[PDB]
């Protein structure tokens, strides 16, 4: 649906040069990198508030680079959900309708349901909380039922307490509306968790593009590696969850961790290199997790020594340079990657 063709625009602090991208229908595409000034504008230019200097913008396959916002026929939700303060929620929802001259009150009561706002339909925008506002936002933004949903920093600015749900709400709309979402964030963790693809843009420059796994487990030199280097995030599926203690599955191994999640939940487990150990044997410690596998590469660093181990699951371990010598740097030594269970943070 969304195609940026050789785009370029120049402002007083942000420079966009030769940007080409293709977000295919229904795909949840995520741009990663830019900070505020950039993000918000790049998206505005897409939405048609800024005509480029050179290049094209093709939504649903229509050259809109020189049209107007009302004509781009999109859904746009700023980070600070720009709700109209002189209209009770409902009136807001309505707006989009009255604007394109439509009739159906079903679409409105149904859209209101889809976002669980029925109970707020009457309140005034300022008495609503972040999410409450954000929902109402998505609500009216999606009443005209477009296919393309442009969102900017919808997550990073909420209480962690809502982020989990928030993410769902979105993932849900992504499908039940068969939306083609363009998500711009500076939070790589958010990026992973919700992308179908990531488009790394640094200082208004496209640098890499591709499925999550391809961006982190295979960065491009310097810039990209520096931005996401050495971090263990395992996409897994909870197999058992007896009494707060989860057992998640990644590839062919099993990981013990903690958190309230039900079996069948596609979750994410974060594990820092400094919480993984390496023994030439697994003893019975308080350590729930202990995986076999060999060493892949040994990145002698400063005082520490990065190590990539293959335990059915790529793991980035970190070690004191000295232990790295008492043991073997041999790229292929049998190894036991053991990490404490209570140090594995799980997200959904």
């Amino acid at each position: 649906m969304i195609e940026i063709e050789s785009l370029s625009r120049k402002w007083k602090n942000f420079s966009l040069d030769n940007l080409s991208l293709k977000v295919e229908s229904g795909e949840y595409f995520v741009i990663l990198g830019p900070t505020g000034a950039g993000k918000t504008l790049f998206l505005e230019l897409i939405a048609g508030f800024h005509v480029p200097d050179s290049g094209r913008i093709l939504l649903d396959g229509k050259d809109v680079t020189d049209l107007s916002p009302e004509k781009h026929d999109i859904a746009f939700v700023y980070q600070n959900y720009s709700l109209f303060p002189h209209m009770n929620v409902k009136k807001n929802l309505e707006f989009g309708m009255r604007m394109k001259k439509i009739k159906d009150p079903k679409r409105v009561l149904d859209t209101a349901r889809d976002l669980k706002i029925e109970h707020l339909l009457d309140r005034n925008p300022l008495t609503l909380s972040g999410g409450e506002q954000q929902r109402v936002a998505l609500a009216r933004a999606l009443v005209t039922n477009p296919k393309i949903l442009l969102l900017d920093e919808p997550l990073s600015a909420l209480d962690p307490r809502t982020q989990e749900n928030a993410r769902e709400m979105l993932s849900v709309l992504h499908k039940k509306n068969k939306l083609t979402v363009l998500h711009i964030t500076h939070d790589q963790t958010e990026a992973r968790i919700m992308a179908d693809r990531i488009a790394v843009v640094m200082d208004g420059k496209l640098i890499q593009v591709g499925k999550p796994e391809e961006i982190f487990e295979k960065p491009v030199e310097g810039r990209v590696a520096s931005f996401v280097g050495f971090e263990n995030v395992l996409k897994g599926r909870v197999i058992s969850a007896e009494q707060g203690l989860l057992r998640i599955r990644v590839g062919e191994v099993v990981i013990d961790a903690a958190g309230d999640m039900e079996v069948g939940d596609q979750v994410y487990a974060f594990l820092r290199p400094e919480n993984i150990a390496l023994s030439k044997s697994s003893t019975q410690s308080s350590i729930r997790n202990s995986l076999q596998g060999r060493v892949t590469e040994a990145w002698v660093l400063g005082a520490l020594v990065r190590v990539k181990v293959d335990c059915g699951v790529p793991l980035n371990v970190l070690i004191t340079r000295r232990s790295a010598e008492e043991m073997e740097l041999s790229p292929g030594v049998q190894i036991y990657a053991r990490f404490k269970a209570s140090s594995v943070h799980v997200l959904r």
Binding site: E44, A47, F49, S68, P69, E70, H72, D73, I74, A75, F76, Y78, N80, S82, F84, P85, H86, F95, G96, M99, K100, R140, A141, T144
Partner: protein, 248 residues
């Protein structure tokens, strides 16, 4: 210490203004209360007031019609002459009253730029439209600067938000921007109306005669001295305070 001195000087200013406008009313409602009662019926007076409020209400509708958009413009865009255009609008509050009259005459006067070529349609000098134009030139800035800060108040995003929901710029401006900046436009209009009502020098030169409230008071003052003078100035203020206060 310092707080004291400063506070004294302040109390001063306060009294200075307060006592002056007070005192003036004191006199009237003291040595000749009746004078007011006379003025109240005196057509010369009522005609001079209703005229002021009238000419004013008009100049304001022009100010509204010009200052408003000049504000929306000035609060969203940035061109090369923003500085200049921005100053010309500001100026009219430093152009000595008289000067403004003369200058205005030079244009709307029977022998001026716009007044000469328009003898058949409308006359300006010593007529209503003459005082209207005078007022506008002196009170317009208020409704402008005030309508700018009004629009400035409503941040862009809301306009952009409406736009992407399918609303053309004017529908945006009309259903959102405007209604939200109302409180500012309302005040500015009224501030205008009052800078108009109270304009003398500027108007006198162009159209001294349909005798506008403030001029009248001067006419009487020279001719019939301070006695038939004060009663009109007191009657005028009470009208300013009734308007100013029924709204601020």
């Amino acid at each position: 210490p310092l707080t004291f001195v400063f506070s004294f000087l302040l109390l001063v200013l306060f009294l200075f203004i307060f006592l002056t406008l007070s005192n003036m009313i004191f006199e009237q409602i003291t040595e000749d209360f009746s004078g007011l009662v006379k003025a109240a019926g005196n057509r010369s007076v009522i005609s001079s007031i209703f005229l002021s409020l009238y000419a004013g209400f008009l100049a304001t509708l022009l100010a509204l019609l010009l200052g408003a958009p000049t504000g929306y413009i000035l609060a969203r865009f940035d061109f090369p002459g923003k500085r200049l255009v921005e100053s010309i609008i500001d100026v009219p509050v430093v152009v000595p009253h008289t000067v403004a009259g003369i200058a205005l005459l030079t244009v709307f006067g029977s022998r001026g730029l716009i007044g000469e070529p328009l003898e058949s349609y409308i006359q300006f000098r010593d007529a209503l439209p003459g005082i209207v134009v005078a007022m506008l030139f002196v009170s317009m800035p208020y409704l402008a600067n005030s309508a700018r800060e009004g629009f400035k108040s409503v941040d862009p995003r809301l306009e952009n938000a409406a736009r992407s929901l399918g609303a053309p710029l004017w529908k945006a401006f009309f259903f959102v921007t405007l209604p939200l900046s109302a409180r500012y436009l309302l005040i500015g209009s009224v501030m205008t109306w009052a800078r108009a009502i109270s304009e003398f020098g500027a108007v006198v030169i162009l159209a001294y005669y349909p005798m506008v409230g403030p001029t009248l008071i001067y006419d009487r003052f020279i001719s019939y001295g301070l006695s038939a003078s004060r009663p009109i100035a007191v009657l005028l203020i009470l009208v300013t305070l009734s308007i100013f206060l029924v709204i601020r």
